[PDB]
């Protein structure tokens, strides 16, 4: 039967990038024509696979990761990128085999008072390994004396909110991102194209 790409690209709520969502897709036929023939995406970059020439390929697993970030941050969802998102929120590997898909969702994810539901990690001691997901809320120790779960000076809650307002410039407007990873193991393949 058919792969539930609808449940991902068409989800009513998206995850905050620090707590990005992962959908494991298996045992289905994937119609990628639905995706690449869409006029509705503003970013659609594939690394190591040709999009049109995906339908005659089988993989053992496909992963669909989705979240929301700033327009200015979409460029960080790529191999070998740096920045608050790539370093501390969502990291692709240098040898990435997949596709990054993004579209402007200012009409959805911003409120007039500002939508504070979407969060990103702002403070972290070291960079994420690829496909790592840090959901910790430990108070961040920016100085010499420790924090003990108490916020304050040099003692910072690690997450921050975007607060998307519809009057934002594109760089501050929310974009929904879907990262498709194409995994091929020494196990029976379960995802092929039309």
């Amino acid at each position: 039967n058919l792969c539930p790409f609808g449940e991902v690209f068409n989800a009513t709520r998206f995850a905050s990038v620090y707590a990005w969502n992962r959908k494991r897709i298996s045992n289905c036929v994937a119609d990628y024509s639905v995706l690449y023939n869409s006029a509705s995406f503003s970013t659609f970059k594939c690394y190591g696979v040709s999009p049109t020439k995906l339908n005659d390929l089988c993989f053992t697993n496909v992963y669909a990761d989705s979240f929301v970030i700033r327009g200015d941050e979409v460029r960080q969802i790529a191999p070998g990128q740096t920045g608050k998102i790539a370093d501390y929120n969502y990291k692709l590997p240098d040898d990435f085999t997949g596709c990054v898909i993004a579209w402007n969702s200012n009409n959805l994810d911003s409120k007039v008072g500002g939508n504070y539901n979407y969060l990103y990690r702002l403070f972290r001691k070291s960079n994420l390994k690829p496909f790592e997901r840090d959901i910790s809320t430990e108070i961040y120790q920016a100085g010499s004396t420790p924090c003990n779960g108490v916020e304050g000076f040099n003692c910072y809650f690690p997450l921050q909110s975007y607060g998307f307002q519809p009057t934002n410039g594109v760089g501050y407007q929310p974009y929904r991102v879907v990262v498709l990873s194409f995994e091929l193991l020494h196990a029976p393949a379960t995802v092929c194209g039309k």
Partner: antibody, heavy 117, light 110 residues
Framework: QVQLVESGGGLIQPGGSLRLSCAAS????????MSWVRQAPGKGLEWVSI???????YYADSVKGRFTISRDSSMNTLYLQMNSLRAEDTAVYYC???????????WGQGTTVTVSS | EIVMTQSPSSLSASVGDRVTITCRAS??????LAWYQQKPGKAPKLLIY???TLQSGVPSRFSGSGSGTDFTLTISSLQPEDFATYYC???????????FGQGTKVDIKR
């Protein structure tokens, strides 16, 4: 004692090299966004460089390939290596602790760089 | 590119006056704004972050307000140590760099 203390500024001919230090106490340099910001006489603050706690670095276009930011965790010190210096590099150079949306809250007192023939 | 337009370039104020300084973003930056004070020969001093939150240790007569494009700093009762230059900063901009307002010099009225 939360402070940033700069040193290393001085007078240097164009094309020379100069290495600035920023010694911190209170703030841990390697746990923070640390920036170099400079101010030319009568002009405004111009960002120079930043190093993330995770190691990522960025540079102003005007200093790319000539300046290098770094840090020594054991010394709790931030550094700016300035090569191929030019007259328009002349400024007071501040080191600062960046809290992004929380603003830039800790600034040093500044060290003065003068580049001239 | 987002531009910050600050006004006025200078204003004159007696002690006790209510002072108001304005900063306009060429496009919406929500609440990504901070205000600073700087005196001749000294480093900047952070006053307000996130458009309207008062930095610790800054006197309560300082207040920031606004979100989106139009922002104001407000000094409800000007004190002798408040004659300085003030300016706004767009926070977390792209490309990397700090976009500051042009600045407002507040001198002594006579």
């Amino acid at each position: 004692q939360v402070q940033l203390v700069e040193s290393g500024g001085g007078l240097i001919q164009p094309g020379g090299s100069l290495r600035l230090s920023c010694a911190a106490s209170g703030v841990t340099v390697s746990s923070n966004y640390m920036s170099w910001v400079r101010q030319a006489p009568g002009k405004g603050l111009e960002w120079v460089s930043i190093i993330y706690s995770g190691g990522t670095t960025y540079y102003a276009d005007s200093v790319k390939g000539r300046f290098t930011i770094s840090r020594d965790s054991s010394m709790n010190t931030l550094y700016l290596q300035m090569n191929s210096l030019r007259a328009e590099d002349t400024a007071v150079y501040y080191c600062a602790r960046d809290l992004m949306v929380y603003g830039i809250d800790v600034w040093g007192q500044g060290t003065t760089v003068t580049v001239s023939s | 590119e987002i531009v910050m337009t600050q006004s006025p370039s200078s204003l004159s104020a007696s002690v006790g006056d209510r002072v108001t300084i304005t900063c306009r973003a060429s496009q919406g930056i929500s609440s990504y704004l901070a205000w600073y004070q700087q005196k001749p020969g000294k480093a900047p001093k952070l006053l307000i972050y996130a458009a309207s939150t008062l930095q610790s240790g800054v006197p309560s007569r300082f207040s920031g307000s606004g979100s989106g494009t139009d922002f104001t700093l407000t000094i409800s009762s000007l004190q002798p140590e408040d004659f300085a230059t003030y300016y706004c900063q767009q926070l977390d901009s792209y490309p990397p760099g700090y976009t500051f307002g042009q600045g407002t010099k507040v001198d002594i009225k006579r």
